[PDB]
Design a protein around this ligand. Structure first.
Ligand SMILES: *[C@@H]1O[C@H](CO)[C@@H](O[C@@H]2O[C@H](CO)[C@@H](O)[C@H](O)[C@H]2NC(C)=O)[C@H](O)[C@H]1NC(C)=O
Ligand SMILES: *[C@@H]1O[C@H](CO)[C@@H](O)[C@H](O)[C@H]1NC(C)=O
Ligand SMILES: *[C@@H]1O[C@H](CO)[C@@H](O)[C@H](O)[C@H]1NC(C)=O
Ligand SMILES: *[C@@H]1O[C@H](CO)[C@@H](O)[C@H](O)[C@H]1NC(C)=O
Ligand SMILES: *[C@@H]1O[C@H](CO)[C@@H](O)[C@H](O)[C@H]1NC(C)=O
Ligand SMILES: *[C@@H]1O[C@H](CO)[C@@H](O)[C@H](O)[C@H]1NC(C)=O
Ligand SMILES: [Ca+2]
Ligand SMILES: [Co+2]
Ligand SMILES: [Co+2]
Length: 354
């Protein structure tokens, strides 16, 4: 295994086709994949999206060996904290490590907000904690159905943070639920006091407030020598095919290859004001935080979304539904294997590097 230089920027590079190494697992090999993300089982027939690897400009990612990762995880906890895209990344990590773990020596247990995947022989866990805004919100139950009015408490994080203490590897995120409305709904008092009044705060201002509460929590509670902290940058959406100069497309649903032309400037609507807030706040802390800068590289992956090959309110989209991607395509979430496996190759690289 060849470790990159500390100074190699892992997030500047290009996508390279490599069906000799990628995907790092097959969909059928991973019994833990949920129906949301098993695109092939769900009817997708092209699989070239699985074959792409990310090649940094100045170095190679080291060959993924799950055993090396699991040795770094022996007697330790890795926890993904955040929204449904961090849950997508957690599912990927589960597949990546479980690839070498024999039957019976692994298990998944979901208890409320916390999902726990155990690897018995290593006494290792890969966990997901639902906190879509990081701070306390009215949307902190992962099994609550949709509401139109999401509300946050930007200075409240202690109750969530109790669940994060003692964890060895922490990967935080938060983005997609910031994007539903122009401004953010911010509670005046506290949910637990029955308060209901909120005001609307500008999206980046409320984000900065959240990131400051989070950073302070980190600074107070994390020992750098015990715990490595990561922050996964904004996972992009691909909802408008004109955004990558394909007006004849249908959202992300007709796309089976990445954007390859590096001289075509484009946007897919990512709110880079939040990216700057996150980049600054994470670099500004005493406790080091490795910023997983996955945004632009993920923007090229117009091909890797679940599209119509997924679920809706708990069941597979029908053939009739799948035939109308304009109405039913999900251009948020990602097929597994696929893009979030790359997000996890960055985590792996950093973990085996220390
Ligand atoms: C996040 O990653 C992107 C690339 O995926 C970085 O943008 C590139 O930065 C290099 C300089 O290191 C430029 O030469 C490239 O033109 C940029 N590429 C693109 C495609 O924009 C960005 O700098 C990274 N940001 C941080 C804060 O790490
Ligand atoms: C890999 O892709 C190439 C080009 O698309 C294809 O010809 C080949 O059959 C694939 N994989 C192999 C041979 O393992
Ligand atoms: C198993 O892993 C956990 C997670 O860090 C640790 O606290 C625990 O003490 C380990 N148990 C043994 C017997 O090593
Ligand atoms: C999952 O962990 C919980 C802790 O709340 C425990 O009570 C339960 O027995 C576990 N479930 C399974 C199926 O092992
Ligand atoms: C790459 O995009 C640029 C800018 O749109 C364009 O000039 C050029 O034709 C493209 N190259 C291709 C498709 O090879
Ligand atoms: C924060 O972010 C922007 C762009 O990423 C930068 O230009 C600005 O100087 C930064 N401010 C602080 C306080 O770091
Ligand atoms: Ca060597
Ligand atoms: Co090249
Ligand atoms: Co411990």
């Amino acid at each position: 295994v060849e470790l990159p230089p500390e100074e190699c920027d892992l997030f500047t590079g290009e996508w390279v086709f490599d069906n000799e190494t990628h995907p790092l697992y097959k969909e059928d090999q991973c019994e833990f994949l949920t129906a949301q993300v098993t695109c092939m089982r769900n009817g997708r027939r092209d699989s070239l999206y699985q074959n792409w690897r990310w090649q940094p400009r100045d170095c190679s990612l080291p060959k993924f060996k799950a055993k090396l990762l699991l040795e770094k995880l022996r007697n330790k906890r890795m926890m993904f904290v955040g929204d449904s895209l961090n849950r997508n990344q957690w599912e990927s990590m589960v597949c990546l490590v479980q690839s070498v773990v024999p039957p019976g020596r692994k298990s998944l247990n979901k208890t409320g907000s916390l999902s726990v995947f155990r690897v018995e022989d290593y006494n290792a866990t890969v966990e997901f904690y639902w906190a879509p805004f990081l701070v306390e919100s009215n949307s902190d139950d992962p099994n609550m159905h949709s509401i139109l009015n999401r509300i946050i408490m930007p200075e409240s994080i202690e109750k969530h943070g109790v669940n994060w203490k003692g964890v060895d590897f922490l990967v935080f995120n938060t983005y997609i639920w910031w994007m539903n409305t122009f401004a953010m709904k911010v509670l005046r008092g506290s949910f637990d006091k029955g308060d209901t009044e909120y005001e609307e705060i500008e999206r980046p201002v409320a984000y900065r407030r959240v990131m400051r509460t989070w950073g302070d929590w980190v600074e107070r509670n994390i020992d750098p020598l015990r715990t490595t902290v990561f922050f996964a940058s904004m996972s992009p959406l691909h909802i408008k095919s004109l955004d990558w100069e394909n007006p004849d497309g249908i959202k992300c649903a007709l796309e089976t290859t990445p954007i390859l032309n590096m001289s075509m400037p484009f946007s897919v609507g990512t709110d880079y004001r939040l990216f700057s807030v996150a980049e600054n706040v994470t670099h500004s802390l005493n406790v080091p935080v490795y910023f997983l800068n996955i945004t632009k590289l993920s923007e090229y992956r117009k091909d890797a979304h679940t599209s119509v090959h997924t679920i809706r309110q708990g069941k597979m989209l029908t053939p009739e539904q799948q035939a109308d991607p304009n109405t039913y395509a999900d251009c948020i979430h990602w097929c597994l294997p696929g893009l979030p496996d790359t997000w996890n190759e960055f985590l792996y690289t950093r973990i085996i590097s220390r």
